[PDB]
Design a protein around this nucleic acid. Sequence first.
DNA 1: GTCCTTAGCC
DNA 2: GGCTACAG
Length: 342
Amino acid sequence: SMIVLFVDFDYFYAQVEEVLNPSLKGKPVVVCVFSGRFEDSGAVATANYEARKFGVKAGIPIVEAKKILPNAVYLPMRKEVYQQVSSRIMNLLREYSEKIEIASIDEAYLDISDKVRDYREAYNLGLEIKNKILEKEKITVTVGISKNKVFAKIAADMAKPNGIKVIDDEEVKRLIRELDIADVPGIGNITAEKLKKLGINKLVDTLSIEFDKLKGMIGEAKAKYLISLARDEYNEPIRTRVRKSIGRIVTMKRNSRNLEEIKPYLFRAIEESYYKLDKRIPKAIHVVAVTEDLDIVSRGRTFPHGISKETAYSESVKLLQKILEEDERKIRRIGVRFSKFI
DNA sequence: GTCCTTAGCC
DNA sequence: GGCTACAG
Ligand SMILES: [Ca+2]
């Protein structure tokens, strides 16, 4: 009882550039966010399987990427192109079950309990999903099928890319015992290391250790949740994610601490955040500053009414002003985030 | 329900 | 780098 079907687009951004650009078949492809500063200032957002065999990965500096593969194909992120392709697949997804939780620009969880009898009909539903998506958008996905959200995700990780994998109630048990902890959704590097010292290498170890000695560390929320996976008791429903804050953040030319030159960046993040809102009026604004050393500093302000675009303008300067005088360091990035919509 | 600094994700 | 939620 309770069948969750999970869908993750493989090397999404790079795959979309491949479908668009037949001249990139075969070779390696590295989609980057270019800073606008120096030559190859920036970071990597994704790489195809061919790029990833060589270490080139999401998050490393572009400069480093080019140390490894000086001649992969390097491409600027075109966020709104993957956004179009993404919403088109999300809609195809939406036809198979009303109960859909969109989790990022490239993964979605389907609850299929009323639409199939057991896993055998699911895995088939899985194949239909895949093929229909590849037909209409020429994009390969991976399908994960399990008893809850988290093991749906894990199942897709084991069969990525282009593929499909079921994890029945039994295999849940093996993975509770013998699967590596960092491979648990919502657990990457920093929290592996938070436990890598601690003696915990698999989910089970968490039951073999005191509760507060975990609570205190990675934090109560994270401790509870993992313990729930250990006990095989996770049962979080599939609900429509609602976007809580929409924002923009842009890197400046020559990072500085003069308000009059910082000002025009600040205002562009505002236009584009309004752009985004889309008929949504927030009550809250935060001015976000990234410093010369890269130590994020944020000041906001909540209003009992919604914030007009113009009030967003003047109000931002006041919050910018506050930062300029409580943190001492120069400013490299500047932005705004809007939240608590009407 | 409010000011703020903290990790997993493409 | 840019995004967004999450942690008390
Ligand atoms: Ca994903």
